[PDB]
């Protein structure tokens, strides 16, 4: 179902709040983003690792030079935090991702995995920043 | 679901400060910050 896959879909307005929050490689790794290829076609790529680009680009008011190691089944390359779409996982794109994973040999993550992963985002949102994260954030 | 937004001083950037938080700007470091205008109805019978 593409609708349940949209729960763990990371929109563009949520990455802006966690451009500098640590534990980034532990909460986003497992979710799916709607990255842009380009004409209105899209593919569901897999958030595998946290990479950093040497290109500093501004996303509205905030700016981030980091990259994301995305992969659509087999086709993997570097990506930036500006080409991600707020659009939810459509039916055609969902089936295309299913065929990319079935054609790649990757197992489809079990729905219980998505259920236990989607709550990580909400527990990270209401996290109290009592430790020394404000200082590294400002730095 | 309102996080009690403040305005910094030297920065003038809106910051989200909940209880049990240190009063500092999200950027550049600032221990002074003020509050936003109210949303209550402000009406002056001009006289």
């Amino acid at each position: 179902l593409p609708e349940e896959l949209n729960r763990v879909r990371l929109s563009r307005h949520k990455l802006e709040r966690w451009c500098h929050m640590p534990f980034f490689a532990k909460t986003v790794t497992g979710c799916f983003v709607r990255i842009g290829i380009g004409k209105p076609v899209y593919r569901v790529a897999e958030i595998t690792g946290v990479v950093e680009t040497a290109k500093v680009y501004q996303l509205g008011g905030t700016r981030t030079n980091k990259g994301l190691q995305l992969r659509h089944g087999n086709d993997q390359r570097v990506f930036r935090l500006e080409f991600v779409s707020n659009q939810e996982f459509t039916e055609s794109e969902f089936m295309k991702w299913k065929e990319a994973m079935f054609s790649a040999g990757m197992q489809l993550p079990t729905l219980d995995e998505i259920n236990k992963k989607e709550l990580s985002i909400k527990e990270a949102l209401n996290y109290k920043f009592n430790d020394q994260d404000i200082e590294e954030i400002v730095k | 679901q309102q996080p009690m937004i403040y305005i910094c001083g030297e920065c003038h950037t809106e910051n989200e400060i909940k209880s049990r938080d240190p009063i500092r700007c999200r950027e550049c470091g600032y221990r002074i910050m003020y509050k936003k205008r109210t949303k209550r109805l402000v009406v002056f019978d001009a006289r």
């Binding site: 929109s11 563009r12 307005h13 949520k14 990255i35 842009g36 290829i37 380009g38 004409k39 509205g60 990506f79 930036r80 500006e82 080409f83 991600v84 779409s85 707020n86 659009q87 | 679901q1 996080p3």
Partner: peptide, 17 residues
């Protein structure tokens, strides 16, 4: 105040650069 997109703010493409 979670995701106020209302679509969006013109999402740039990867193949457009």
């Amino acid at each position: 105040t979670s995701t106020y997109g209302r679509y969006g703010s013109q999402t740039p493409m990867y193949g457009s650069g």
